[PDB]
Each structure stands twice: as structure tokens, then as C-alpha cells.
From a paper:
The BBSome is a cargo adaptor that recognizes a diverse set of membrane-bound ciliary proteins. It binds with its cargo to the intraflagellar transport (IFT) complex, a large heterooligomeric protein complex that is transported along ciliary microtubules by the molecular motors dynein and kinesin. We recently reconstituted a heterologously expressed core complex of the human BBSome, comprising the subunits BBS1, 4, 5, 8, 9, and 18. Here we report the structure of the human BBSome core complex at an average resolution of 3.8 Å for BBS1, 4, 8, 9, and 18 and 4.3 Å for BBS5.
Author numbering:
A (entry chain H): 285 to 505
B (entry chain J): 26 to 80
C (entry chain D): 168 to 423
D (entry chain H): 63 to 77
E (entry chain I): 642 to 800
F (entry chain A): 249 to 587
Amino acid sequence: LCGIARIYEEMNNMSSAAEYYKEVLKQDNTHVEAIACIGSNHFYSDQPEIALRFYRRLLQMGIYNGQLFNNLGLCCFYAQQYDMTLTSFERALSLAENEEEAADVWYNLGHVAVGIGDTNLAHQCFRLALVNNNNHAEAYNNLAVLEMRKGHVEQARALLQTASSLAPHMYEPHFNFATISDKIGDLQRSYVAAQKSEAAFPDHVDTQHLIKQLRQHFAML
Amino acid sequence: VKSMFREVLPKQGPLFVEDIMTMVLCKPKLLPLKSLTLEKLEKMHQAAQNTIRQQ
Amino acid sequence: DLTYIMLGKIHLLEGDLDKAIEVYKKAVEFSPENTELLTTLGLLYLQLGIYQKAFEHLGNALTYDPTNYKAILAAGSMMQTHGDFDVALTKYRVVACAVPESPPLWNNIGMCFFGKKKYVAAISCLKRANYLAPFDWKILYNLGLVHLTMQQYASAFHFLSAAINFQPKMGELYMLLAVALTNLEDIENAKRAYAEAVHLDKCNPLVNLNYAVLLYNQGEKKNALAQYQEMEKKVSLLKDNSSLEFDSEMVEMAQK
Amino acid sequence: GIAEMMLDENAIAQV
Amino acid sequence: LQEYFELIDHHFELRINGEKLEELLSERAVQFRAIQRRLLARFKDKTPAPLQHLDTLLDGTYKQVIALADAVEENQGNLFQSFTRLKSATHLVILLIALWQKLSADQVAILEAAFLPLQEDTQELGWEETVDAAISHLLKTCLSKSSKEQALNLNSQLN
Amino acid sequence: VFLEVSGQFDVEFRLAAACRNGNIYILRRDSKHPKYCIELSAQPVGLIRVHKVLVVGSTQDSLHGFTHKGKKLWTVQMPAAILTMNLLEQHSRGLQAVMAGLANGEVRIYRDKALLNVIHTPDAVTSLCFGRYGREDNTLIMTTRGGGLIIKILKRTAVFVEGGSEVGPPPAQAMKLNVPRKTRLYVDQTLREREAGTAMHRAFQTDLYLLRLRAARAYLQALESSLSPLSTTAREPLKLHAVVQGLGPTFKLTLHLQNTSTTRPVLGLLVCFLYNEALYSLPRAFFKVPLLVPGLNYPLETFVESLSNKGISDIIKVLVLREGQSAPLLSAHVNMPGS
């Protein structure tokens, strides 16, 4: 029953995957690798309180990793439980195995820091994630939205330029290139930018309001 | 005469009137929990470096 | 037609909208059938303060094209400023199967449930926007306002103070953040936060001077009526000062 | 817990 | 500068022949990896895989990947041996322009890096792709009246 | 390329013609010059007149209409690409309609502003006439894009109506207010926040107050060492990677420099990588970087030659020319363990 719900997540058939993971939890109520994969698929799609209940229980089995004090830190913040939200991160900064691993805990701390509104704090959270690990493609994009809030256009447009070349998937630098390079006016690079923000993620809304914004300019006036 | 405690809230909010094309961020990620084979195979391979560090 | 809106781009960028309307009033004259020229005219009337003409122009754009997403939110905002919350969602449900993730959309439906007193529904609907757009002026101030109605005072300090950092010059954020403090115990911070509140507006709102008497109700007696008579006359506003006047009846009762 | 293809995130794609 | 233009061409043609002996080995290495994958799909200890079609065809495509492997280094070694010719030429040119009109040693300093990428294997680095790109933006804010690189700007994009 | 005539002679003569420049030109009876000119936004795909109004077809699928002198009257949008336009003329009924052979295969029929009918059956139609064929008086011949034929025949009983229903905006119940459901596990959490919440606020600040200190004490620990791949004075970033051909004992390391100025070419810097001596060589080890133009990215490649199986991180620096040894943009590259 775990092997059948593992190929459904390969095709992203979560309509019929997460029912089987409700059976490996029906009997066998302590299987560890079907507790996270329900407690993660509730943190996304707006059940950040139920997803905490699957992670405080997984603490009480007594595994005590560094990866779990990250996930326990994120669920308490988005469920608005401000006590355990940040002590769980300081224990996650400690007891981290590799130097590439303490980057990701600094990076998730950045999304906390955007949530309180402090950008000066947030600017040095992605930076420390970046000096502890380069080629962290999700932070290069994320640092240079904070740059464009200040005004450093040419600084921002080079970080998205190198966030894309590290992740040749993951539509978010590609679309974000084509709202910097569109406001300037370069409608040729801002097409190939918003070309890959369609092939790497179709059914986006604000790509289809941008290619048709450009293809009216390309035909005639 | 016990207390007033009347702090009248505005009961209204700043409704949007149009969408604005803006820039959006990468979303926060939950780290995976490694399996008990991956915990064993990393621990064995980590000790494989120290036995070749001396030989 | 395309020569018009670039000319309309000029007067909005440099300044006021009053000369910019007559650019569009010429533009609707030449082509009364184009929906894109009408909808931008509708938002321009609404920023002036509506004289019911903006309700007419959007319906012309809605009949000529019923699925234009920018047209719906304007009439979605236009109905919602008076009432018609059940009517508003019926307009919003047309477009929610087309733009399933829009943060200006999901803020409004969250604010529409706030009218019908489905309080626990709105926070589950507003927080779908704050995940999707992490910093906004408006999503954060809405998300903090529903908590003070629900008396969840400790969480409302987190969102109200998270929108001071993104635009400091607001008055009413400073007004509500002080009310988020007095249910906690930072009375030293409460007088300091109120000190920046009364200064940053200087003309428009009258609610925060009614807040001045409630802080002054505890251990103070002199400047109560001084704050109460401060800007008592309203120049031109349709805001609900009458519900505050029930509270201001208790304010003048303290000094009589 | 958070992957669809070549380690991509979620809740801005779908689900 | 006319005699300088002869040496930049036959070096670049040797780079073109350097760009000609490389693609023939790659597809034959693609042929060499395909024949290994044909072996490992077949090589097992039973009947339907013959020991023939497994040994002698391997050697001919093994002779393919070595008969040019000793030849791709001869031009590339001569490419490096001609790169010293190319630098000693472009050092000699850049000395004369410093004195053809008198230059204040900062104008030659910009030219000391504009013509001089000290490279070894410039097939991915583009020495020829650098020297036109350098003098492209160099046309603004260095000095006026110098027409030799302005004539060389014509020979730049015209190879 | 497209022209027509109203048709009168010796008292008045209107000759209209469309051109390759996307204009409408009309001619008087004897004045041999274009007296009145009106324009469109794109190429007209067909020029057909009605009894007094004259319609065009734009390739942006906006079928206009212009009067005798020529002004804007009405405009019908079409939901597919226009491909053929023609004139409908019934001798019996006296009906003057305009055809529109669309791209998906339908053939829409229009009067002034009304859709009359459609024929959905065939593929894309390129050719179209409507007249009498042989003995029958009502024939509307069309033609497939592949080359085949399809013939329609009108009957005497059928007269053309609107006959159009009221197609509304959203009659489907596809999404009836998609809002997630909040269970009991949230409604007990608000009671914990309501009474004991005042302890929760002071718990957040004094834990966040250590967080600002712990960040800045670790930020300045690397900024003075200049570990960050970003700079401000000399304005390039530095990205670097292990390439696919870098596997085994041999190993290849690329490096990416690119200026972020618009007009300020940085000049003749130095790249050197100090590294703890493992058993690899890297024979050059100290370059002189070329003149970085503003805008292009530069690949810079090396050749690690490891002899046995280890793994230890390199640090690659870039310096200013002679004076400042402070080494901006030093990137502590973490190596892969090769065999």
C-alpha cells in the first residue's frame, strides 16, 4: 500500500494517492514515510494546522533530525502559533550535518522575515543561505525581488540571469525576468523570457496575459 | 459604570479595484526526511572517508 | 485608439486625472464599442469619487464583452462598497474559474465574507492571498483587521506591524496598532505609537481622536475634551461617525 | 514532501 | 597591420580546422557509446547472444576514436604554437600605436587588455569573439583621431 | 490587391480599392486621384460592399464597415481567423449578406450586425461563391483546403432568421466558491490564543531579538572575509559550476563572469584560487582576465587533474589590478568527490 501511492505521486495523481496514504495510516499508525507525505500535502493547499499535527506526532516517536526542526518551524508560523515557531529554527541551525544543509534553514528563515516585514533582516537571510551554499537557485531569484523593491535594476537583472541558468526548469525566474525586461522596453529578450515561463509551467495566468501582450506588439501597431 | 471598553473598529477594508502585474517570490520548501537506508548509507560512507584519510 | 491611451499614460504619470478624463472622454466618443477604453475610464471615475457615471460605463463594457477580467473586479468593487454581498460573489464566481490564484481577487472574496459575518471563512480565504503575494499594502491590513474583531489580539499585532514596514505614511494602521497594544501590556509603547498616529494625517480621519479619550480615560483628566473637540467638524465624508457618536456620548459623559 | 519534477516547489503550481 | 592580418587568419583557419576535427570524433563516440550499450544489453552467459558481433566490430569503431585522437592534438599544439605568434604580433602592433601618436600610458593600458586575452584553449573562450567585442564598446570614451583600429574595426567584423 | 465598384456610369462612378499598405482608397468619376483615404490597423483580407455601406476584413479578425464617403459605423469581432469573404445575393428575396469563411471550417453569414446562420461541417474553406448552378437558383459552392469539393443547396421554404439563443457568460457550476474547510483542529486553537495570548507576544520578540543578533554576527563574519559572490564597487557577480565532462580522475571547472554596468568596462583584473593542497594540479592556477564588456557573460574553464578519490573545497578569488588585495567575490566552491 506504500508502493502503490508512490507511483501516483510520480504522475502527480494526488486525487488517488493521498487516499492510499490514509490507509497506511489506518492500520500501521507509526509508518514514518507516510506521515510526512500527508503532513506536507496539507501544509500546501491551506491546511497549515492539520499539517502541524502530523509533525508534532512524528517528533514524539523520537527521531530528532535537523530536517524535522525545519519543517516544524514552518508549520507553526503559517498556522499562527508564535511560540514554537522560532526556537525550532535555532535548534535547526544547530545540529545541521553539512554546510550545504544549513543554507536551507537560513533560506526558510528568509520567508519568515518577509512575513514580519523586515527586509534588512530578510536581505541577510538569503545572503547567508547563499554564502553557505552557492548555486542555490531558489535564493538567487528570491534575493533579487528585494533588490527591485529598492531600485537596483541592473543588479537584479543579473541575479535572475543566473538563477535561470542554474535551474533550467522552475518557471519563477523566467516569468520574473519578463516583468523587469518588459518595463524597460526590450520586447525581444522579454519574449524568450516569457517563452520559458510557458513551457516550464503552462496554465499560468500572468504568462498568458503577457505573451498576448507581446504578440500584439509584434504584428503591427 | 464598570467600563466603557468601546473601541469602534472601521468594519471596512481597502478593496482592490484592479489587478497589478507584480513580481512573485519562490515559495518556502519543506525539507524531506531521509529514509533509514539513506541514514545508514550516509553514515557508512562518512566513515569510509576517515578510514582512507589515514591510509 | 492606440494613440489615445499613450496620451492618457502621460497625464497620470506626471500628475492629476482631471485633464486625463477629457482625453478619455474624447476617446469614448470616437469608439463607444471598445471595452478597453471604457474600463480604464471606469477606474478613472472611481478614483475621482463616483458620481454614479462609473457604474454606467462598466456595464457598457460588460454587455459588449462578459468575460473581461479587469471589468469584473471594478463592478465587483463597486457593488461591495454599499452592500449586495450575495450579489458580489455571483459576479466573482464568474471569473474564479479563470483566474484561480489572483491575490486581488482572493482579497475581495475574503472581504466579502466579512460583511456576511462568516468570520472564520475569511481568514481561511485571505491567507490564500498572503501566501501568494507575500508583501502587499492591502492584504496585510485586511488580515489584521479581522483578528481584532475576533479578539485574537496577539496575532493581530503580527500582521498590523507587518504592514507598517511596507508603507509608513498611513494613519489608520497606526490607529489600529495602538488598539492591538492595549489588549496586551505595552502601555509605554501605546502612548508612543499613538503619538505618531495623530501626526501623520492632519486632516481626514476622525475616529482616532475618539480613540484619544479611551487612552485618556485611564489616569488622566485634563486634555480629554481637548482631544474630543479636536477637529469635531467633518468637512465632507460619508463615514460612520454615528457609531462612534454612541461612544462619543460616553466620552462627553466623562466631562459634563 | 515538496516535489513534482526535478525538485520543484508547490502551492504556486497547484495543490 | 597588413602583415598582421595574415597571421590572424591562418590561426583562425587552424581554429576552424580545430572546429572541424572535433565533431567527427563526438558522433563516433556517440557511435562508441551506442555499441557499448548494444553489448551490455546483449552480453550475458547463455545462447541467443553470440560471441561474434561482440568483438571485431568493437575494434573498428575503437580505431575510429583513436585515428583522430592523435590528430586533434597536432593542430591544437600548433594552435598554441601559433598563439605565441599571435601574441607577439599583437604585442608588436600595440607598441607602435603607443608611439604613432604619443600616448600617456593609460591609453595603451586599456589597449593592453583589449587585444590581449592570455588564453590557452580559446575554442570555448573565443579570442576572435573577444577582440571584436572589446573594440565594440571601446569606440566611446578613449580618445579621438586614431584611425588604425577604426580601420581594424572593419577587419574585425569581416573576420 | 482588393477592389470593387458600386456600379454607375456617366453621372457618377465610385471605385474603391484596398492596397498592400493597409489602406482603403476610393475614386471619383473623372478625378483620377484618391479623394478620400481611410485606414485600418492591418491588411484587409476582403473588400465587399453592401447596398450603401462597405465592409472590410482585418486579419486581426475585426470586420468593420464604412459608408459611401466612409466613416466608422459598426464592428463585429470574429472568434477565429478570417480566410475568405464574399457577397450573398438572392434574386428572389433581395437579401444582401456577406460571407466569412473562417479557419476552423465554419462559414459565418452576416447582415449589418446579425449572425444569420453557420455551417459547421467541413474543414477549412478557401473558395466560396453563391449563385445559381445550372437549373437550381440557390447554390453556395465551397471548397476544402486539401482540394476537395463540398456543395450546399438552399430550399425554397427556408428563409434566414436570426434564430439565435441567449448565450450567457457563466451558466456552468464548475466552481461554486472554492474555499477550504476549517475543522475542529483550528477552532480549539483560537481559544488558546484568546486567553493566554499576552504571553505569546513577548515570547516572539525576545526570540526574534536574538535572531537579529545571530544573523548579523554571522553576516559580518563573512562580509569582512568577502565570501559573497556579489559586489558593489567593481560590479560583477561570480557563478561557477562543475560541468558534465568533469567526471572521474579528470575534472573540468567552468567559471562565469559578467559585468552589470551599462557603460563602464572594468579593466584587466586578476583571478587566482588559493586552495588546500590535495593531489590535483590545475596547471595554470593564475590567469589574467580579459576586458569585460558590459552585458556579455564570460565562460572561463580550467582542468582539475585529481589522481585518487578525495573531496575538498576550493576558494576562487578575483582581485583588483594592483592596489587592493582585499579580494572581492571570493567564492568558496565546494567540490564533488571524484574517483
